[PDB]
Design an enzyme around this catalytic site. Structure first.
Site, PDB file in Angstrom:
ATOM      1  N   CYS A   1      86.300  -4.174 194.683  1.00 17.58           N
ATOM      2  CA  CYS A   1      86.861  -3.540 195.748  1.00 17.58           C
ATOM      3  C   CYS A   1      86.230  -2.208 195.946  1.00 17.58           C
ATOM      4  CB  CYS A   1      88.362  -3.866 196.060  1.00 17.58           C
ATOM      5  SG  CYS A   1      88.761  -5.348 196.486  1.00 17.58           S
TER       6      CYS A   1
ATOM      7  N   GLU B  79      90.665  -5.980 187.152  1.00 16.10           N
ATOM      8  CA  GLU B  79      89.695  -6.457 187.821  1.00 16.10           C
ATOM      9  C   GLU B  79      88.358  -5.608 188.016  1.00 16.10           C
ATOM     10  OE1 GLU B  79      87.554  -6.155 190.897  1.00 16.10           O
ATOM     11  OE2 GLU B  79      86.477  -8.196 190.393  1.00 16.10           O
TER      12      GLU B  79
ATOM     13  N   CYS C  66      91.512 -10.642 196.022  1.00 17.09           N
ATOM     14  CA  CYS C  66      91.892 -10.210 197.279  1.00 17.09           C
ATOM     15  C   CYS C  66      91.056 -10.454 198.489  1.00 17.09           C
ATOM     16  CB  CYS C  66      92.310  -8.536 197.190  1.00 17.09           C
ATOM     17  SG  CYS C  66      90.763  -7.740 197.214  1.00 17.09           S
TER      18      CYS C  66
ATOM     19  N   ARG D  29      96.437  -4.080 196.667  1.00 17.54           N
ATOM     20  CA  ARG D  29      96.526  -2.732 196.078  1.00 17.54           C
ATOM     21  C   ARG D  29      96.305  -1.490 196.778  1.00 17.54           C
ATOM     22  NH1 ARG D  29      94.792  -7.339 194.071  1.00 17.54           N
ATOM     23  NH2 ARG D  29      95.185  -7.799 192.013  1.00 17.54           N
TER      24      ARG D  29
ATOM     25  N   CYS E  31      85.821  -9.586 196.536  1.00 15.92           N
ATOM     26  CA  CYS E  31      86.750  -9.555 195.774  1.00 15.92           C
ATOM     27  C   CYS E  31      87.313 -11.134 195.790  1.00 15.92           C
ATOM     28  CB  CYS E  31      87.747  -8.607 196.393  1.00 15.92           C
ATOM     29  SG  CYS E  31      89.563  -8.367 195.792  1.00 15.92           S
TER      30      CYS E  31
ATOM     31  N   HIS F 282      90.251  -8.601 202.704  1.00 17.19           N
ATOM     32  CA  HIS F 282      88.860  -8.334 203.254  1.00 17.19           C
ATOM     33  C   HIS F 282      88.791  -9.053 204.737  1.00 17.19           C
ATOM     34  CE1 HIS F 282      87.595  -5.335 200.482  1.00 17.19           C
ATOM     35  NE2 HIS F 282      87.801  -6.083 199.632  1.00 17.19           N
TER      36      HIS F 282
ATOM     37  N   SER G 134      91.263   0.249 195.930  1.00 20.03           N
ATOM     38  CA  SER G 134      90.813   0.717 194.684  1.00 20.03           C
ATOM     39  C   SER G 134      89.879   1.760 194.706  1.00 20.03           C
ATOM     40  CB  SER G 134      90.575  -0.237 193.747  1.00 20.03           C
ATOM     41  OG  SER G 134      91.544  -1.155 193.638  1.00 20.03           O
TER      42      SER G 134
ATOM     43  N   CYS H  39      90.900  -2.851 191.146  1.00 21.54           N
ATOM     44  CA  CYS H  39      90.014  -3.710 191.511  1.00 21.54           C
ATOM     45  C   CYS H  39      88.623  -3.317 192.054  1.00 21.54           C
ATOM     46  CB  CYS H  39      90.569  -4.530 192.512  1.00 21.54           C
ATOM     47  SG  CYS H  39      89.643  -5.870 193.293  1.00 21.54           S
TER      48      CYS H  39
HETATM   49  N1  FCO Z   1      94.104  -6.112 196.847  1.00 22.17           N
HETATM   50  C1  FCO Z   1      92.864  -5.687 196.917  1.00 22.17           C
HETATM   51 FE1  FCO Z   1      91.127  -5.433 196.835  1.00 22.17          FE
HETATM   52  C2  FCO Z   1      91.267  -3.856 196.049  1.00 22.17           C
HETATM   53  N2  FCO Z   1      91.540  -2.681 195.766  1.00 22.17           N
HETATM   54  C3  FCO Z   1      90.857  -4.655 198.378  1.00 22.17           C
HETATM   55  O1  FCO Z   1      90.927  -4.353 199.333  1.00 22.17           O
HETATM   56 CL   LIG Z   2      94.444 -10.236 199.576  1.00 20.47          CL
HETATM   57  S   LIG Z   3      91.160  -6.351 194.567  1.00 29.50           S
END
Ligand code: FCO
Ligand SMILES: [Cl-]
Ligand SMILES: [S]
Ligand code: SF4
Ligand code: SF4
Ligand code: SF4
Ligand SMILES: [Fe+2]
Lengths: 482, 283
Positions: free
Chosen positions: A479, A15, A65, A409, A62, A69, A432, A476
């Site tokens: 993120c 991502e 995800c 992640r 994101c 957050h 990330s 990601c």
């Molecule tokens: N899983 C996810 Fe997004 C990332 N890296 C966050 O926090």
């Molecule tokens: Cl998530």
């Molecule tokens: S992510």
């Protein structure tokens, strides 16, 4: 052979926006630089807003995800507001977020990673690809990979139905707010969640966990590379009672072969090699600053460089499973024996070298998915239909709070400071970010940069293992940069 | 569709996106995303899901673009940041040259059949363009206009959009083109866009005027806690009155919930999202 320098931009089947540049000498990576090439600046966008808005705004970091957050943000707000989340709301939050762990891991293995090992059908987006892609599976096993990729498209969609049952919609839930969860689970909707969950469980147990070990058994060389620092972070996630002291994943740091406690005051974010003003280097998140400097000489990423007491650490399923050392799944134990000749009961029985490897990170993620099934099953027994899930707290004039959780992640925290009833500062230190960061002010590489060292590149015209290693970490970059 | 039918080429470029517009598309119930990919379109470039990588992936897109000049569909997810000479969004590198989102849209935009600005970021600027931002995050239509690029744009907003709005707009367009050819077809699509570029089949109805809690609103019966599902959500911040979307009917994620039932509408399809819809949790 001598040197070849290889740049990959975009790195795909991750991502977000990532460039990787590696120096290869004599068939191995000997240096690496990772660049997160897109910036939005959520930490400045958030300033001046009603703090309650944060739990919507931050999700847009994101779309893979967003529940992570959401969770970190509402935990931060809960603390800042002195909101006491009702027990049933704590459990409801765990059901919303836990369902997206299932979605995200399944998406990652099948829709992002599996093409590293599986040839898809002969049409875009599965072709064209490297002429020598090192795709080793038999016709039958390759077809199982494709069949499961296709099935997984439906399974991950069902996971998002699970998220939406109490979360409102997905991506970008409506159902987590300061004070708890906005919708009390009804008996009828708990039946609906359980029915979907059963389908996901069956897929995880019967298809996903076995396929990772089975594909891994055809790529045994991939347990021998990608070690990097062999250093990990977990900050805790999924509270199991109302004390704030007990979590499904307990916190810890692992580095230089030793377990150590996690003290968040030891986190500092460096920027020498990041596109931010030099005067902002080295700050703990409670005093964090985000001042972009896209023309700064020497910098190569919009990702800051977080260090823990000076250490460069990785995060994610491997980190959590290594720190917590749970029992392995029954099917993992069996396939380790049958396919690898390995006797193992708990995760660490893989040993440090094999766990901290390219394929070990895929195995850890599959094992963690299985582990999450048991947690969700527990929450479905614990939840009480009809019991209130939210309190409605007044916005404070002056306050601060920090929310800590584990995104799929890796480790995630949000810090908020409120002044005059508005956001004065909001700082995010995400998963990330820990994995895909550049060098720090001392020149020490980020975790994935270091894990690239030693990766084999026996064919410079088909340097497939560079991005295979990166993908094992499930990057990601939305993120990472925010 | 069929595996061996006509499937036009699509390039999906991510600017300042969160990948949530891609993920929402993956949630399409009917047609399934597998069927969309294998039977409806040919997704030739998409950084999240495609097999190849790096300069090779960019060059693949360029080869297809040359073959299908004037004929490919270009999806944009995320805004396009213009500050700092485009440096806030680099999407690739080829020939030792970095390619910013600004560069990419100037390259492919003129040669697309149409540009689909998917999501509020791409359509209207969205969160990356909101107060406190500093990247010059720009909506697709504005960026193209500022650069003299006349390619038709269709906005499919939401944060994220519902998959049915994305797939449905594609279906609308492909139908119009089947019946009328490309230019005649795109003219039929433009006829059903509202003043914000949105297809009126999906965005032509107001949420509040169709809301199941409208009687409560009119009676002044307002929930004081999110978990009271009897009252209207207006005092809790619901922006349904100012929002044009069909969420009240198709709902979300296979029909299992929607924002107003669960919490509040935050007006995510509207051109002023987020700032004109904030604070989210009061009227
Ligand atoms: N899983 C996810 Fe997004 C990332 N890296 C966050 O926090
Ligand atoms: Cl998530
Ligand atoms: S992510
Ligand atoms: S419109 Fe919303 S969901 Fe789509 S890219 Fe922008 S922030 Fe993400
Ligand atoms: S809940 Fe929202 S959309 Fe429905 S009647 Fe009340 S204000 Fe209008
Ligand atoms: S109900 Fe409102 S916030 Fe939810 S998806 Fe529809 S327009 Fe967006
Ligand atoms: Fe940050």
């Amino acid at each position: 052979t001598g040197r070849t320098t290889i740049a990959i931009d975009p790195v795909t089947r991750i991502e977000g926006h990532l460039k990787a540049e590696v120096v290869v000498e004599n068939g191995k990576v000997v240096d690496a630089r990772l660049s997160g090439g897109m910036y939005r600046g959520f930490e400045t966008i958030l300033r001046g807003r009603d703090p309650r808005d944060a739990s919507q705004i931050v999700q847009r970091i994101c779309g893979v995800c967003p529940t992570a957050h959401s969770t970190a943000s509402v935990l931060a707000l809960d603390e800042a507001f002195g909101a006491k989340v009702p027990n049933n709301g704590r459990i409801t939050r765990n059901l919303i977020f836990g369902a997206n762990y299932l979605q995200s891991h399944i998406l990652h293995f099948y829709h992002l990673s599996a093409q590293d090992f599986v040839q898809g059908p002969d049409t875009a987006p599965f072709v064209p690809r490297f002429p020598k892609s090192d795709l080793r599976l038999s016709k039958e096993l390759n077809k199982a990979g494709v069949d499961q990729y296709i099935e997984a498209l439906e399974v991950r969609r069902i996971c998002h139905e699970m998220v939406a049952l109490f979360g409102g919609r997905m991506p970008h839930v409506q159902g987590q707010v300061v004070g708890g969860a906005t919708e009390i689970p009804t008996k009828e909707k708990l039946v609906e969640y359980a029915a979907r969950f059963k389908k996901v469980r069956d897929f995880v147990e019967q298809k996903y966990v076995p396929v990772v070990y089975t594909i891994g058994s055809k790529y045994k060389d991939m347990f021998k590379v990608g070690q990097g620092f062999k250093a990990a972070l977990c900050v805790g996630a999924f509270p199991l009672d109302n004390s704030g002291k007990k979590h499904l994943f307990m916190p810890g740091v692992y580095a230089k072969g030793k377990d150590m406690p996690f003290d968040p005051s030891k986190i500092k974010e460096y920027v020498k090699y990041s596109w931010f003003a030099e005067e902002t280097t080295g700050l703990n998140y409670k005093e964090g600053k985000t001042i972009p400097a896209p023309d700064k000489a020497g910098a190569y990423s919009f990702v800051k460089a977080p260090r823990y007491d000076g250490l460069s650490l990785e995060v994610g399923p491997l980190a959590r499973m290594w720190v917590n050392n749970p029992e392995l799944s029954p099917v993992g134990k069996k396939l380790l024996k049958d396919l690898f000749g390995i006797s193992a009961k708990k995760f660490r029985d893989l040993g440090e070298e094999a766990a901290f490897s390219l394929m070990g990170r895929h195995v850890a993620r599959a094992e963690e998915t299985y582990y999450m099934l048991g947690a969700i099953e527990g929450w479905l027994k614990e939840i009480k239909a009809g019991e209130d899930t939210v309190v409605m707290p007044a916005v404070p004039a002056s306050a601060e709070g920090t929310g800590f959780t584990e995104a799929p992640r890796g480790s995630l925290l949000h810090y908020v400071k409120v002044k005059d009833s508005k956001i004065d500062n909001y700082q995010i230190v995400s998963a990330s970010l820990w994995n895909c960061n550049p060098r720090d002010d001392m020149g020490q590489r980020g975790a994935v940069e270091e894990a690239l060292i030693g990766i084999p590149v026996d064919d410079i015209q088909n340097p497939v293992n560079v991005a295979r290693l990166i993908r094992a970490f499930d990057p990601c970059l939305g993120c990472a940069v925010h | 569709g069929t595996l061996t039918g006509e499937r036009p080429p699509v390039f999906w470029l991510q600017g300042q996106g969160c990948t949530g517009c891609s993920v929402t598309l993956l949630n399409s119930v009917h047609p399934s995303i597998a069927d969309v990919l294998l039977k409806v379109i040919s997704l030739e470039f998409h950084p999240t899901v495609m097999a190849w990588e790096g300069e090779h992936a960019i060059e693949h897109m360029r080869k297809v673009a040359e073959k299908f000049k004037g004929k490919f569909f270009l999806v944009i997810e995320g805004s396009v940041p213009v500050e700092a000479d485009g440096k806030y969004c680099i999407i690739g590198e080829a020939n030792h040259h970095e390619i910013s989102m600004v560069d990419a849209l100037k390259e492919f935009g003129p040669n697309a059949a149409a540009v689909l600005a998917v999501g509020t970021c791409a359509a209207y600027g969205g969160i990356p363009a909101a107060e406190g931002s500093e990247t010059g995050a720009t909506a697709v239509s504005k960026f193209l206009g500022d650069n003299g690029i006349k390619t038709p744009v269709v906005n499919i907003p939401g944060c994220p959009p519902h998959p049915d709005w994305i797939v449905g707009t594609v279906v609308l367009a492909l139908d119009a083109i089947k019946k009328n050819g490309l230019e005649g077809g795109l003219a039929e699509v433009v006829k059903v866009l509202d003043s914000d570029g949105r297809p009126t089949p999906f965005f032509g109805r107001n949420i509040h005027e169709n809301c199941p809690y409208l009687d409560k609103y009119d009676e002044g019966v307002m929930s004081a806690t999110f978990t009271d599902k009897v009252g209207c959500r207006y005092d809790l911040g619901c922006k349904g009155p100012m929002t044009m979307a069909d969420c009240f009917e198709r709902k979300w994620n296979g029909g299992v919930n929607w924002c107003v039932q669960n919490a509040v509408c935050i007006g995510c399809v509207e051109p002023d999202f987020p700032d004109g819809k904030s604070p989210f949790y009061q009227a």
